Amino acid sequence: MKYMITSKGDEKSDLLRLNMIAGFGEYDMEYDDVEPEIVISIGGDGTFLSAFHQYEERLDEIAFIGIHTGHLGFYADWRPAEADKLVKLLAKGEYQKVSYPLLKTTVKYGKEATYLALNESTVKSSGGPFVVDVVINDIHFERFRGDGLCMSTPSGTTAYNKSLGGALMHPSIEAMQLTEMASINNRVYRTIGSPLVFPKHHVVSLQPVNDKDFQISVDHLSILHRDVQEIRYEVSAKKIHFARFRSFPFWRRVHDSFIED
Amino acid sequence: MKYMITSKGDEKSDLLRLNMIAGFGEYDMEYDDVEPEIVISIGGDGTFLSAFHQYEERLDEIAFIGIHTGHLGFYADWRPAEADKLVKLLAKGEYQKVSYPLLKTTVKYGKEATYLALNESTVKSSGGPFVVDVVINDIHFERFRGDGLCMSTPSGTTAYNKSLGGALMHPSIEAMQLTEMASINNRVYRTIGSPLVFPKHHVVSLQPVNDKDFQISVDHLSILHRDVQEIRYEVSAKKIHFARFRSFPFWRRVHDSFIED
Amino acid sequence: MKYMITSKGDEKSDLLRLNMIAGFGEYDMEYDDVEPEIVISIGGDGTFLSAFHQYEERLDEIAFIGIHTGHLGFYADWRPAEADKLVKLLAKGEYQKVSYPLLKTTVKYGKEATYLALNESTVKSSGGPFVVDVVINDIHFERFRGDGLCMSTPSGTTAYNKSLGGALMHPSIEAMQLTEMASINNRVYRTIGSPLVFPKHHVVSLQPVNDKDFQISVDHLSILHRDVQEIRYEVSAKKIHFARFRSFPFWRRVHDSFIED
Amino acid sequence: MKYMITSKGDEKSDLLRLNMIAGFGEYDMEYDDVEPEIVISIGGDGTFLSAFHQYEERLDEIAFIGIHTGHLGFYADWRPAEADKLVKLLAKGEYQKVSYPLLKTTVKYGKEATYLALNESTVKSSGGPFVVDVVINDIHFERFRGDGLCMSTPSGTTAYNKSLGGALMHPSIEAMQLTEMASINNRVYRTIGSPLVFPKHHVVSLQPVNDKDFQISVDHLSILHRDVQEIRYEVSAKKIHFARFRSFPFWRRVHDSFIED
Numbered sequence A, B, C, D: 001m002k003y004m005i006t007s008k009g010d011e012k013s014d015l016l017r018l019n020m021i022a023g024f025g026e027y028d029m030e031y032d033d034v035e036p037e038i039v040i041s042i043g044g045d046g047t048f049l050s051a052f053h054q055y056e057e058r059l060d061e062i063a064f065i066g067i068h069t070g071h072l073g074f075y076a077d078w079r080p081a082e083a084d085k086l087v088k089l090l091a092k093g094e095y096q097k098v099s100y101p102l103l104k105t106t107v108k109y110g111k112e113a114t115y116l117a118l119n120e121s122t123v124k125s126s127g128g129p130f131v132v133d134v135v136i137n138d139i140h141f142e143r144f145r146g147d148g149l150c151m152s153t154p155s156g157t158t159a160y161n162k163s164l165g166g167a168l169m170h171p172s173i174e175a176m177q178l179t180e181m182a183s184i185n186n187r188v189y190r191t192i193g194s195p196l197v198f199p200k201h202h203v204v205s206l207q208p209v210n211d212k213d214f215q216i217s218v219d220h221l222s223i224l225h226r227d228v229q230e231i232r233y234e235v236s237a238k239k240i241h242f243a244r245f246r247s248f249p250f251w252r253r254v255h256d257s258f259i260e261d
């Protein structure tokens, strides 16, 4: 297999990467960071998100693996001490692939840009008040006034979405979840309050009310967009694929990350 | 079609029912409350939940319709003024069927009882402290200490689940959602806090820790169970079917019920 | 000083109590559980709440001290290993007194009963729906529909109130805090949602709307009241007094109980 | 009395102001915007906050009055139709003064700046991750990681603080309330979660952990501070004073603004 390895870049991660490369040299494994079939991320979830975005144009051809060199990362399945066992198992093709859903964000102006999110896409104002109309499948649902909005994938539900009161969703559910950031609610201004969970093929559109400039973040890459006509969220047709070598169920992963491990 | 009509029993609902019966008499419609194919509920969501439980043994043979005689009911699609138009459309078979998921609860003792919920199943203590171990697909996930737990269907997400901070979920998603009621969280006792959303085929089991008596409510029918070994939640294979005569999208229904109408 | 010692009653607490009694015998200390001036509670916060209610008729004549024999108790200032140092310091009168506010609950029928709470007073229905009008200083404020209501003292804010989303309040603030349990909020039914913090001399009255039977709990002593006309909450004029031998600030106590220790 | 009138500046507010000025001309009232004793704000709460900050250096010499020309403003006690009755009552000195507490924020660098807030002071990062140590009366209480923090006065509790889950506090309570914005909570990172309510003379200090640049907002005036050593919050010794001409209790004001009016 062609493979590549990204590192967080501290001394620990860089040496783990060099040692795994040396270990891969003893098998029919070619290091190739243009067209890898296996992408190994060594670091944390931030490192793993950067790896996903480096290869977002070849998701259907890649299985990802995460090694956490600090504390547990949610997209990590290996500790550094297990890296040799990983090399051997990867080499012998001894794995099954697991797929998580992805979120597509489309930004239109006055022209379009699309982004793929593994965790979430959020939107805030570029300074002034944040006010958008929320339109669900072309039905006007609410006018949102507040700090911003967060649209999460299932595997993203344990990240920013969790901090905003959202529900944790198992990743086999093909859905996206919208959570509010500090909405205004009084007798004049009203939002639903609750997180909202949307299935595949529903489209959630945000439409400016006054200011048209927004800070849009996709997995914490945050970009100012000007003259925005619409921001459209839907579950992507594209999926990220994971190499899985043993059972590490999602709910155990949640348990280990939030309850005790 | 065989049909029947349940009424909340106030003067308004009883007369609407008699007038609809008279209207049905002018078509090939037989009143039959043993084996109806159409069940019409006139009242509110409580009335509609009672209708569902009166016929839970023939869900695959029945389409339900709700008329709200007070303010909007979530399971209601008609106002009383539209009852004549309903009679005519029902008679001419001018409808499509829509299915919502259901929740199955199994209670084992030391012997089993199962219940079907359209909104939710909740569990509390019979007086003493409520303490259960939460086991997800045979994996011990947390020990819950607090007031109780609520497992909601998708259409139930807008009911008790909403009041407990849960996410609102579109009913095409085959899932159930677990929410906490006032858990204890300190350095000794820890729960996940967040609502949890489970797909079809996941089993959530509650296991007593000390007290074995629980008050279990299914759609607000609340029953004391003694000597409980286990309470198991899963998405039912059974579905409730609705007669639909026009588009009334779920998110518009949410909008009309919580934002403005 | 006259003193007494209550024990949780496990082997550990009973022996600690006997050893402290023996230690007190070596000083001008008389064991007296009718008119103690010092009440020592050995156990947990439940034990300490029982001690407070055993002596609620002599609060102005008593300083309380808590020993936690299990993990940290919020009303506890001593570990069991420090009991000897406690005996010596108590005996030599080497302490300052600290006062926390208390909550008064009055229940009227059709006749009155009053209770004093150190943590909180809550109200629920005796089975049926819970619906009360909330009246603040004779001003109708909201009609509450839901599971119940919790009125907390400042030192109670870290207990049930915390689990219900309430704010943690420093105990020098003479106030009470009202929190909701799972209110219904839709276009027909509306509550404030937020916790409410009331100063001394404000009166919060709950008035039945339909059912007149309520389960009222004061520090987890829960009693059915029938034919209730009114439930009135106000900050008590009475205060619980603590013996303090060293600085153990409230916010450090919070830190140690919820963050790390 | 010397008085001045600020207007939101729309046609409606400017004409109300001119008509009130004309009405004041018929009494012993001098228009003076350098040293007014009465400051009348015509507009909304934003207008009223701007009036407060225009005169923050003479709070002990000023009574404020608010007129809301749009929907109810929380700092507003008059509708535009009552402006004549206001002029007459103000002129004849027919009023009592009411005082609300204020929040003092001190920012130190490496040099100090202080600000007075009527609603709240918030702190966020200037872009990068927000990470501060929270120190309460020189006791390290938690390391906060998340979007930011909000410190609210009592009258501010119904504003941003409310949107962040904070408790609503009656303004006679001399306190400040700290609320979190989307904190990270997992097995590695822990915050208290709950709002915290501090009495007079407690000092809450925020200390940078890595990045030293912060966006600090005081009543929605938002300013970048660089090279920050510390941000200190305490209840101000200074108070804003209101002219009151009739009873309009705080809890009725809350009721009218959030429940119905």
Ligand SMILES: Nc1ncnc2c1ncn2[C@@H]1O[C@H](CN2CC#Cc3nc4c(N)ncnc4n3[C@@H]3O[C@H](CNC(=O)NCCCNC(=O)C2)[C@@H](O)[C@H]3O)[C@@H](O)[C@H]1O
Binding pocket: A044, A045, A046, A047, A049, A072, A073, A074, A075, A119, A120, A155, A156, A157, A158, A159, A160, A161, A163, A219, A220, A257, D128, D129, D130, D145, D146, D147, D181, D182, D183, D184, D186, D188
């Ligand atoms: N106010 C907020 N509250 C909560 N989360 C927030 C907030 N703002 C942004 N984010 C999330 O940061 C992601 C991106 N950063 C790497 C990551 C992750 C991750 N992904 C998952 C997952 N799928 N499941 C469970 N845990 C996960 N984690 C865990 O978050 C912790 C690290 N993140 C933070 O410090 N963020 C705060 C600002 C700084 N960020 C970064 O520079 C990049 C590590 O523990 C990591 O393991 C974004 O995508 C949001 O989601």
Ligand SMILES: Nc1ncnc2c1ncn2[C@@H]1O[C@H](CN2CC#Cc3nc4c(N)ncnc4n3[C@@H]3O[C@H](CNC(=O)NCCCNC(=O)C2)[C@@H](O)[C@H]3O)[C@@H](O)[C@H]1O
Binding pocket: B044, B045, B046, B047, B049, B072, B073, B074, B075, B119, B120, B155, B156, B157, B158, B159, B160, B161, B163, B219, B220, B257, C128, C129, C130, C145, C146, C147, C181, C182, C183, C184, C186, C188
């Ligand atoms: N603390 C609580 N907070 C919030 N809900 C609670 C709480 N406790 C129990 N329940 C729910 O009551 C259901 C059952 N009652 C009929 C119904 C409904 C319904 N179903 C849906 C739906 N699927 N989507 C959107 N709205 C829905 N509604 C709307 O609730 C309002 C009526 N219910 C209440 O007064 N309950 C409080 C106790 C009294 N109950 C009853 O005697 C029977 C009407 O407005 C009705 O339209 C149970 O199943 C829970 O879910």
Ligand SMILES: Nc1ncnc2c1ncn2[C@@H]1O[C@H](CN2CC#Cc3nc4c(N)ncnc4n3[C@@H]3O[C@H](CNC(=O)NCCCNC(=O)C2)[C@@H](O)[C@H]3O)[C@@H](O)[C@H]1O
Binding pocket: B128, B129, B130, B145, B146, B147, B181, B182, B183, B184, B186, B188, C044, C045, C046, C047, C049, C072, C073, C074, C075, C119, C120, C155, C156, C157, C158, C159, C160, C161, C163, C219, C220, C257
């Ligand atoms: N759903 C709920 N969620 C959260 N609390 C609830 C709930 N229902 C009731 N209560 C509280 O129980 C008190 C009374 N019980 C002894 C105590 C305490 C206490 N007082 C304080 C304080 N002032 N500050 C910080 N921690 C405190 N604790 C800590 O609570 C833990 C123990 N309590 C519970 O298991 N209760 C659940 C039901 C069983 N209870 C009891 O048999 C008696 C121990 O850790 C103890 O240290 C009542 O008064 C409420 O407040």
Ligand SMILES: Nc1ncnc2c1ncn2[C@@H]1O[C@H](CN2CC#Cc3nc4c(N)ncnc4n3[C@@H]3O[C@H](CNC(=O)NCCCNC(=O)C2)[C@@H](O)[C@H]3O)[C@@H](O)[C@H]1O
Binding pocket: A128, A129, A130, A145, A146, A147, A181, A182, A183, A184, A186, A188, D044, D045, D046, D047, D049, D072, D073, D074, D075, D119, D120, D155, D156, D157, D158, D159, D160, D161, D163, D219, D220, D257
């Ligand atoms: N995410 C957020 N969620 C909730 N509040 C937020 C958020 N961010 C900032 N703020 C608050 O805005 C204040 C400042 N703006 C004028 C005011 C007020 C006020 N003060 C009180 C009070 N003491 N009690 C009850 N209601 C009050 N209101 C009511 O807020 C509504 C208007 N405010 C907003 O649109 N803000 C969002 C951004 C735009 N802002 C402004 O350009 C200036 C009107 O209804 C007004 O009446 C700041 O100081 C925060 O507190």
